Amino acid sequence: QSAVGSIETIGFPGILAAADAMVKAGRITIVGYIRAGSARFTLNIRGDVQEVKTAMAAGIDAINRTEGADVKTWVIIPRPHENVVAVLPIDFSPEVEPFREAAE
Amino acid sequence: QSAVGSIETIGFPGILAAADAMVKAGRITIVGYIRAGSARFTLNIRGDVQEVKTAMAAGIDAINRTEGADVKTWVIIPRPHENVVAVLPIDFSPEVEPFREAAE
Amino acid sequence: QSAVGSIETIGFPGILAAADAMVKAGRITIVGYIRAGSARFTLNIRGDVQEVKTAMAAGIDAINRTEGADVKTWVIIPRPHENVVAVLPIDFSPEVEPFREAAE
Amino acid sequence: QSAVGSIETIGFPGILAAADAMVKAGRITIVGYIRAGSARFTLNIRGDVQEVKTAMAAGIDAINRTEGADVKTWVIIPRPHENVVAVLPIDFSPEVEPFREAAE
Amino acid sequence: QSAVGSIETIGFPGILAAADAMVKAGRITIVGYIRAGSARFTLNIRGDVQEVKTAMAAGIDAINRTEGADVKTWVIIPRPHENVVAVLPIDFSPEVEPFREAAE
Amino acid sequence: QSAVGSIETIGFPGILAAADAMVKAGRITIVGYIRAGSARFTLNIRGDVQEVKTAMAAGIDAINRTEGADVKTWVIIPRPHENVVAVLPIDFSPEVEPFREAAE
Ligand SMILES: [N+]
Ligand SMILES: [N+]
Ligand SMILES: [N+]
Ligand SMILES: [N+]
Ligand SMILES: [N+]
Ligand SMILES: [N+]
Known part of the structure; x- marks a missing residue:
């Protein structure tokens, strides 16, 4: 399992900029x-x-x-357990598959 | 990829006026x-x-x-990555296609 | 395109009264x-x-x-662009068609 | 069109009590x-x-x-226009039909 | 109609504990x-x-x-009217039927 | 019925870290x-x-x-009643079945 990063901000423009x-x-x-x-x-x-x-x-x-944007909270999890990957919306999907292949 | 602008306000009338x-x-x-x-x-x-x-x-x-309206947050992203365009609701749809053709 | 008016209040009773x-x-x-x-x-x-x-x-x-009701924000847009009418929920629907015909 | 009453409170128990x-x-x-x-x-x-x-x-x-409950806002509208009855969730439905017949 | 009790708290753990x-x-x-x-x-x-x-x-x-949990609001209604039972989510369902039979 | 633990925080990164x-x-x-x-x-x-x-x-x-994360509220319930397990989203599902078998 590859690492997961999560960042949260107030407002959509800030999350667009982060993305x-x-x-x-x-x-x-x-x-x-x-x-x-x-x-x-x-x-x-x-x-x-x-x-x-x-x-x-x-x-x-x-x-x-x-x-108008501020980082409220963030975390990096190096090796997320499979139970976490299954329950929380942090898994890969076919939509982001071309970007996964390009990243690795 | 053409630029993306994002603006956020308090209240719907303000977003209607901005639109x-x-x-x-x-x-x-x-x-x-x-x-x-x-x-x-x-x-x-x-x-x-x-x-x-x-x-x-x-x-x-x-x-x-x-x-009663105030701009809370805004951003402009000049050349948004395809992964961003796919995941976030910033892509073109057929509904806004006549307006895309008129803009370019 | 006929004008659009938008009004926002705190609480449903206030929006019912405005309506x-x-x-x-x-x-x-x-x-x-x-x-x-x-x-x-x-x-x-x-x-x-x-x-x-x-x-x-x-x-x-x-x-x-x-x-207990207060007007938080309001606007009037005299001639809303078609792109605005399409994206934002300000267009006419068949439900309000008898009231459109009566208004004009 | 019969009158409409609308009341709003903080918390569900308060709205249950009002109901x-x-x-x-x-x-x-x-x-x-x-x-x-x-x-x-x-x-x-x-x-x-x-x-x-x-x-x-x-x-x-x-x-x-x-x-823990407080009335935040309320209104009574004596003769609501049909356009209001259609757009806002204040119309009768078949679920409450036996209670409408009993009331009148 | 049997009585209805309603309790509201801040946070899910508190409602789980109450349940x-x-x-x-x-x-x-x-x-x-x-x-x-x-x-x-x-x-x-x-x-x-x-x-x-x-x-x-x-x-x-x-x-x-x-x-971290606090009771915000609560009520007990001894004999709730049928119109209340129908509109508000306080009626029995088949899911909780084995628990209804055990209670009575 | 095995025990249930519930934890609530402000922000998604904190819940990811807890998970x-x-x-x-x-x-x-x-x-x-x-x-x-x-x-x-x-x-x-x-x-x-x-x-x-x-x-x-x-x-x-x-x-x-x-x-940026803080624990707001938490609880542990040693032997949750079946009525609680049915109504609240705390029951096992087939998605988490391989993790249930591995835990026991
Ligand atoms: N910022
Ligand atoms: N404003
Ligand atoms: N008012
Ligand atoms: N009260
Ligand atoms: N508490
Ligand atoms: N923290």
Whole structure:
């Protein structure tokens, strides 16, 4: 199981900015997003632990540069258990398959 | 990939005002809107980077002029990655196709 | 494209009061309402710009008279672009067609 | 068109208490409820204007007596326009038909 | 119509604790739960008025003992009208039928 | 009926961190998660009471170590009643069946 990165911000523009910076800075795959409530949005990414780390730094940076956006919470999980991958929306799907193949 | 603009405000009237000003001021396509929670609404637009910039300025202006509405957060992403376009609701749809053709 | 009026209040009773006052005061058509989150509700109306203006004043007045209700935000857009009408829930539907014919 | 009464409170127990008091105190029909967001709940009722008035007073009273519940907002509309009845969830349905017949 | 008890707390763990205490302390049936918004959860129960009273006391107690949980609002309605039972999610379903038979 | 553990935090990254720590620290099964509103997320786990206790401690610890995340509320129920298991989303599903077999 490749690493998972998760970042949450207030407002959609901030999560859009994080999304674009993350996938450009590291060899990662964006696997989904969550409308968390209270105008907060979560972005979930997958890839090698070091690539997720690089992406996360660029994501935080993009959010800081985005007007009205703030990073509320983030985490990187190096080797997520299969039970976690199954229950939480962090698994790969066929939609993001071309981006998974390109990342690895 | 043409640029993406994203703007978020408190209240629907403000997002309606932004929508109408943006599409009239620049050669852009409104691709969707998000009900973000907490009475916040997101509008997403696509087009040439300079047209999105012109639209964004007019959108911010329309929101400022709208009673009880405030721009909470906004961003412009010049060349959004395909993985971002696929996962986030910023892609073109057939509904907005006549407006895409007119913009370009 | 006939004008669009949009009004948002805290609480459903206030939006009910606005709805009834607006359609009685001007020859307008109520096209929909939005559950905006945080107990806020949006009402969207269509009609001639002057009729929408008359309706909006009566709506604001009805909300002010309604216990526990306050107008949070409102706007009137005289000639909404087709792209806006398509993406945002402000278009006419067959349900409100008898009221459209009666208004014009 | 018979009158419409609308009451909103914080918390579900309060709306349950209002519901039961209203239908017992007046010859009214409960037509629906709304989960308004932020733990607020709306109850909508229909009937003769005087019966709705009697029910509303009993509803407010029940909410006041309910632990942790407060009436946030309420309204009575004597003769709701058909456009309002169609768009907003205040119309009769077959589910509440036996209670409509009993009320009148 | 047997009595209805309704309790609301902040957070799901608190409603889980209330659920388990209520059904163990009294001869009642849990009929459903509501995700009320703002991280608030409602639990609805049915049974004899005295059994609902006993359950409610145990539920409040369980919530008080639960870390980070507080009872926000609660009510007991002895003989809920049929119109209330039909419109609000407080009626018995086949899923909870074995627990209804065991309670009575 | 095996024990149930429930933990709630602000933000998705915190619930992801709790998920991975819990399943690795104890022989437990993650049965589901809840989008609770207000950017709060609930995680529900099942297993032997002592395993759930070990997992819960590791979960709390993971949340404390996660940037911007805080444990809002948690509970452990040793022997949940069948009525609770049926109504609330805490039961096993075929998706988590391989993890149930591995835990026991
Ligand atoms: N920012
Ligand atoms: N404004
Ligand atoms: N008011
Ligand atoms: N109360
Ligand atoms: N508590
Ligand atoms: N933390």
